[PDB]
RNA sequence: AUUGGCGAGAGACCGAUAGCGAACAAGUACAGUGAUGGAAAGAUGAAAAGAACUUUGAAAAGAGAGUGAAAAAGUACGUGA
RNA sequence: UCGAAUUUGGGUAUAGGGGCGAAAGACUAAUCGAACCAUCUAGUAGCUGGUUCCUGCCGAAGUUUCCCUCAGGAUAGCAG
RNA sequence: GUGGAGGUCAGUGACGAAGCCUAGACCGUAAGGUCGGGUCGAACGGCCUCUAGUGCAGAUCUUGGUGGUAGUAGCAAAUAUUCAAAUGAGAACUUUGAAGACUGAAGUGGGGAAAGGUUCCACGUCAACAGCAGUUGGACGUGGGUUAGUCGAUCCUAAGAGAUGGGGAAGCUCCGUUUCAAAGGCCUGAUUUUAUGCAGGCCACCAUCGAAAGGGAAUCCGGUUAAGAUUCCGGAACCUGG
RNA sequence: AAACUUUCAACAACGGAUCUCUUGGUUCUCGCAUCGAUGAAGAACGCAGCGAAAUGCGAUACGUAAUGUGAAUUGCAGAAUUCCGUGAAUCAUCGAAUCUUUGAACGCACAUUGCGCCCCUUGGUAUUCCAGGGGGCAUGCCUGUUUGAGCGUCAUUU
């Protein structure tokens, strides 16, 4: 339950902020789990989705299919992983979009910033 | 691309106008080429880092003029702070704790004394 | 119109009173406002006891004279009996009225 | 709101013109012009005797007829038949009323405080919450109430040391000081016969 | 434009709203190094200035067209 | 003649736009504009036109002063700038 | 009136800059509503009133 | 005290002819010389995957083919009296 | 009728119980025996119209007295 | 019978909730309830209570939608069209040619003032619009186009409007326009690093706004564009200030 | 007999009711006090690679500076990809600036993008004419400064 006065239940507020989120926010918004491998490996749980992260699809008609984030579209709430897309009749190929908290994060893009925010979170960072 | 202001800081008065005249040039050859290119998106930086030249320019500018007026009265009312008119008008803090040492006398004498009740 | 037999009212309504109706929605937030506010000010003087002393008097009339009553504040005839001046009493948390 | 249906200047055409005597707009040019206004019939016109804020709400009872109703719902919670019939699983409770240890006002976490219901015998009312969540029916569903449910055992102490938190987040269960005792909680919807675990000391204080 | 810059030996600017006719010569004098022998102006329907500078016969306004760029 | 060939004679303008607040309220002759009430110091509004009132008040424009106001007071109008370089 | 002030001008400048259609990659942007100029403005309908 | 301003939390309130006039580029479009008057207008689909290709037609389009869980969802787009 | 008490553009002045009128209560932006706009204002109406589901039981009055009362009330009667 | 609220049926439901259609079935005197079939796609019921913005055939009711009338009235003023070719999917209406007519110089011609605002011109182009039609267009889409010392404005004053001094008004403001005001700028001495120093009078005119037809400094001819010209080009002049 | 008319059903229309939805409204409660001559509110015009709006901004024009975050924006194009970084972003924050023409609106005026004057400076031979750049010139009132007026008036002086 709630127990802050500072914090609101209101179902109108609550989808206007997520709806109206900035980009900063929906970049935490936009955040996924790391594998059993990643999650033993780190200490953490999840994390913000980045551009060059390796991921796993685990659910919907993709589920099992591997790859590559190409692109976080923070405009529409999903990523784009390479190599996972839809055929069109006229030869073109599109991508699909997918949401992080149904992607599994397989192999991390790190840098400083990668880094110092698993320390702060915890992580041992082997 | 584009300039950058901590860059534009270590350079002195003569270096920026310089600079800013150049960048006019390169602008004045852009804006000729936009008529033959369906489209020139590199116009942008070059508009943007004059906007910055500018910037820096003024802050050496203003702040020459408030090393001149450092420490003294009657500063620039463009380098004065803008709080509010209200704020502006407001008695300073010196003002307003100004009693007369009839009250000062009756303050020391008899302040508000603390206490507890005990039962 | 009058009709039947019933008592004649005197309900005043015939001015734009319902511009002017005060319901006290808030008595329950006013309530805790109040709360806090002791609660603050006790904290802000603590330990004085967040109200000065009283002295007892006679209400007046003959509907209420049998009865005593706090009062405003001790007399200054009754500060100088008790053996201090009316200003330090005030200072030391003595209600003192002079009329 | 109290100017809603009544911003307009509209007044009646009058008879003549072959139209109803309601009060139009006046004007022209957007479509809006010549419409009928201010009337409880009219598109976009004022409600019928608008509500206003002071209808009375909230309703005085006399204090000793209060008292008189939380009496008989405490004496409620310790008949079977009206426990059984307002709808909780205690058919194979021990004994009504139902008094634990007062070790249970000081237990702390969710986990052994759940533990001690089961041990006591609440573990099919619980089961029946929150297996009886259920989306709202209607449009109060988007006015914050969404989910609805059967309600849970009622925890009764004397003192509160950890209890209150330890059931705060099991579904359905509510806790209680015996100085209170809601008649919200001992009667839920009117109907008599809360299903109530009480405390040693909390059974002892009743008196 | 284009016609008057050889067929009249006449350049063809868009100007600030708010330049004259000496401000426009002092311009075109400082920013092509040419001289000046007349400057006419209009404003256009879309609210910006045109102006026709003719150049003195002692400058080619085709060849100081290729030399700025345009053509 | 006092409806379709007079209105043939409409071609002149009673008002033209006013300087202040643009309408084409601005009475020629009487160098008056009806809407704001310019050239008056005051600008022109009454409590019988709530609805004009809510046309032209605040609010209704930039506020490209006052939308700051805001924020300044709830950092306390501070003074100087920001200190610490980069991460 | 081909003897018009500055000011008149100015305004006629700026309707004829506003008089065009909708851009057409306007609709192709994520969560477009807009499906036309709805405020397009021509001299044989509505007069513009200076 | 507070039908204004700013920041919050709520409801046995209304649910697109309701609720503010305005859920949407609404005090907008538009009307009037002017003061002023002042609308209508939300919903494809999880995803455009918004129908490649063939054929008839000047073309719109039709008929196939295909996408889709559904085209008894084709942008004249939920249901569809 | 057509060389003047002529016709007419533009500018300008007169503003609502006010103007203006070779005078018709004419005209004053299709509005005139008092313009138009908004507000008071959801103005008052003994007067016209309307007043939304079912079944069951009982079941009238248009008469008395008073009223600037006579298309309305009070009063008694009839009814539940 | 309807919207919402407390409780309960650990009620129904993407294996299909709600809604909608159904001369298909059942229950109730009735208000209504229940079931099957079709369509559909996300929520919704029974019961006990609580609560109301709770039930429509009418109000020349409100808003919106739709009929019969009805392929009906009407598209009959302004003398009037015709042949051929081109273009085009398509020509009574577009283009060209030929012919027949009309306006008949207080024009159906050539320009302007107010007003409009791009309607001008070109290219593309016909879903909507054009009293039929349309390949055309003042439509639609995209662009191009308005060049001044001499033409106007700008200056002057007209009937008027209107600050200041001052007076009135609770006040928004009103009067008044030179008034009961201490209401200003000309020449000359000038060492020209540089602007002044004392001179001696000079009317007493009181701000300012008010005319694209009144007053008023000065430009013409020829040529030139798809569209500009007394403005551009060529030539030939004139005025003002210095 | 058909046609026609009428009734019912199925399918197809017309139309947009019903059901479900909801970044909106409405009401109650709580906290706070902050516009403007340092030029507000409001108005006009303009600014983007490709925008008519809405939103943002002011010729430094969907913005500059600073701070934080830490890799986007996205309709297309373009760019970036040294992105393990003083560094993306239509991000957040915001204390430094810019802030056209206006507006109480302030040189005068304004149905004009009209007409002046003062200081510094530059160019045209130039204290005087013309032009460019920068900075200025409203009213009432207060305190003070300076220069004054009045046989209002004191003393001293011809
Ligand atoms: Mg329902
Ligand atoms: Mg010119
Ligand atoms: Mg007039
Ligand atoms: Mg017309
Ligand atoms: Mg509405
Ligand atoms: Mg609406
Ligand atoms: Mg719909
Ligand atoms: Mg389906
Ligand atoms: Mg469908
Ligand atoms: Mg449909
Ligand atoms: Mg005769
Ligand atoms: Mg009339
Ligand atoms: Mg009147
Ligand atoms: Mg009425
Ligand atoms: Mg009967
Ligand atoms: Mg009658
Ligand atoms: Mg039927
Ligand atoms: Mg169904
Ligand atoms: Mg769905
Ligand atoms: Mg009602
Ligand atoms: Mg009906
Ligand atoms: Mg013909
Ligand atoms: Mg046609
Ligand atoms: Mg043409
Ligand atoms: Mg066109
Ligand atoms: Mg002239
Ligand atoms: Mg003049
Ligand atoms: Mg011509
Ligand atoms: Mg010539």
Not at chain 4, 157 to 167: P, S
Not at chain 7, 20 to 35: A, E, G, K, V
Request: proline share 3%; aromatic share 6%; charged share 30%.
């Amino acid at each position: 339950a709630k127990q802050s006065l500072d914090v609101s239940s209101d179902r109108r507020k609550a989808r206007k902020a997520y709806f109206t989120a900035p980009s900063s926010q929906r970049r935490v918004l936009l955040s996924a789990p790391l594998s059993k491998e990643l999650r033993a490996q780190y200490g953490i749980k999840a994390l913000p989705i980045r551009r060059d992260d390796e991921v796993l699809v685990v659910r919907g008609s993709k589920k099992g299919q591997e790859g590559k984030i190409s692109s976080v579209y923070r405009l529409k709430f999903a990523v784009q992983v390479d190599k996972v897309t839809k055929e069109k009749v006229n030869g073109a190929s599109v991508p699909i979009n997918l949401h992080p908290s149904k992607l599994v994060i397989t192999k991390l893009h790190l840098d400083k910033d990668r880094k110092a925010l698993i320390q702060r979170k915890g992580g041992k960072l082997e | 691309a584009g300039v950058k202001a901590y860059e534009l800081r270590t350079k002195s008065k003569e270096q920026l106008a310089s600079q800013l005249v150049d960048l006019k040039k390169e602008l004045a050859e852009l804006k000729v080429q936009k008529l033959s290119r369906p489209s020139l998106p590199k116009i942008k930086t070059v508009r943007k880092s004059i906007a910055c030249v500018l910037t820096v320019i003024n802050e050496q500018q203003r702040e020459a003029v408030r090393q001149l007026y450092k420490g003294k009265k009657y500063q620039p009312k463009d380098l004065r702070a803008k709080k509010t008119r209200a704020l502006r008008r407001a008695l300073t803090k010196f003002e307003a704790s100004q009693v007369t040492e009839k009250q000062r006398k009756k303050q020391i004498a008899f302040p508000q004394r603390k206490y507890a009740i005990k039962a | 119109a009058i009709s039947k037999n019933l008592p004649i009212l005197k309900n005043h309504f015939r001015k734009h009173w319902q511009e002017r109706v005060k319901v006290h929605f808030d008595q329950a937030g006013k309530k805790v406002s109040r709360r806090n506010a002791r609660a603050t000010r006790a904290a802000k003087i603590a330990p004085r006891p967040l109200d000065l002393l009283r002295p007892v008097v006679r209400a007046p009339t003959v509907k209420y004279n049998r009865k005593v009553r706090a009062g405003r504040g001790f007399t200054l005839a009754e500060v100088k009996a008790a053996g201090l001046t009316a200003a330090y009493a005030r200072t030391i948390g003595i209600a003192v009225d002079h009329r | 709101s109290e100017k809603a249906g009544h911003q307009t200047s509209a007044e009646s055409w009058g008879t003549g013109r072959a139209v109803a005597r309601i009060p139009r707009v006046g004007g022209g040019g957007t479509g809006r012009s010549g419409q009928g206004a201010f009337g409880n019939m009219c598109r976009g016109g004022r409600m019928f005797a608008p509500t206003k804020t002071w209808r009375k709400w909230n309703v005085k009872v006399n204090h000793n007829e209060k008292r008189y109703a939380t009496a008989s719902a405490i004496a409620a919670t310790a008949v079977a038949s009206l426990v059984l019939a307002r709808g909780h699983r205690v058919e194979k409770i021990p004994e009504i009323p139902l008094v634990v240890s007062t070790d249970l006002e000081s237990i702390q976490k969710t986990k052994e405080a759940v533990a001690a219901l089961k041990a006591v015998g609440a573990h099919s009312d619980l089961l029946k919450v929150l297996k009886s969540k259920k989306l709202r029916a209607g449009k109060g569903k988007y006015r914050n109430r969404r989910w609805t449910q059967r309600r849970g055992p009622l925890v009764v102490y004397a003192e509160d040391n950890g209890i209150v938190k330890a059931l705060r987040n099991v579904p359905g269960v509510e806790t209680a000081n015996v100085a209170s005792l809601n008649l919200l909680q001992l009667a839920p919807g009117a109907h008599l016969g809360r299903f109530v675990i009480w405390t040693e000391a909390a059974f002892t204080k009743l008196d | 434009a284009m016609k008057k810059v050889e067929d009249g030996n006449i350049l063809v600017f868009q100007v600030s709203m708010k330049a004259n006719k000496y401000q426009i010569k002092k311009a075109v004098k400082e920013l092509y190094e040419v001289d000046v022998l007349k400057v006419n102006t209009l404003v256009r329907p879309n609210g910006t200035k045109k102006a026709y500078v003719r150049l003195t016969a002692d400058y080619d306004a085709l060849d100081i067209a290729n030399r700025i760029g345009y053509i | 003649g006092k409806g379709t060939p007079s209105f043939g004679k409409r071609h002149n303008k009673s008002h033209t736009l006013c300087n202040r607040c643009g309408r084409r309220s601005f009475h020629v002759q009487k160098k008056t504009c009806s809407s704001c009430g310019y050239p008056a110091a005051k600008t022109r509004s009454y409590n019988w036109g709530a609805k004009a009132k809510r046309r032209h008040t605040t609010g209704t424009g930039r506020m490209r002063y006052l939308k700051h106001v805001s924020r300044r007071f709830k950092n306390g109008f501070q003074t100087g700038s920001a200190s610490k370089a980069s991460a | 009136a081909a003897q018009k002030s500055f000011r008149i001008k100015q305004k006629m400048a700026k309707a004829k800059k506003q008089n065009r259609p909708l851009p057409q990659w306007i609709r192709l942007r994520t969560n477009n509503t807009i499906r036309y100029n709805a405020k397009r403005r021509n001299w044989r309908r509505t007069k513009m009133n200076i």
